[PDB]
Design a protein around this ligand. Structure first.
Ligand code: HEC
Length: 107
């Protein structure tokens, strides 16, 4: 159960482990991964102009803070056969910080 974090450390966590494939803001370019704007309160594989794996669309989960934290532990376990080649944010306070920044930077 995620509760709160620091969008300051959450930003520095993103810049090192997320920024290579992703972009936040409104109207951000699709790089390797999709643009994460408005991800919270939006179903998996709904970003316009991006080609997702069948599995990402199959999952059909409304992205919430609890759904995201379970996913960011092991992305390949939560969604099997996904093209997100990321290990995972194992340390919970790392996820809690990231989601706090991600809940703000995705609007
Ligand atoms: C590549 C080097 C990636 C890194 C680092 C991270 N992500 Fe990723 N992500 C990547 C891909 C290729 C995809 C597409 C998934 C597919 O199977 O098609 C994604 C997807 C996401 C999603 C879901 C997208 C959606 O449902 O609309 C999320 C929420 C996501 N990625 C988050 C995320 C975060 C928070 C990361 C770092 C901390 C991160 N990704 C890293 C590729 C890569």
């Amino acid at each position: 159960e995620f509760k709160a974090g620091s969008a300051k450390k959450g930003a520095t966590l993103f810049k090192t482990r997320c920024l290579q494939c992703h972009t936040v803001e409104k109207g951000g370019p699709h790089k390797v991964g999709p643009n994460l704007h408005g991800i919270f309160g939006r179903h998996s594989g709904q970003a316009e102009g991006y080609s997702y794996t069948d599995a990402n669309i199959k999952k059909n989960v409304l992205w919430d803070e609890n759904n995201m934290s379970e996913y960011l532990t092991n992305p390949k376990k939560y969604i099997p056969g996904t093209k997100m080649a990321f290990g995972g944010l194992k340390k919970e306070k790392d996820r809690n910080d990231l989601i706090t920044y991600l809940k703000k930077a995705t609007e």
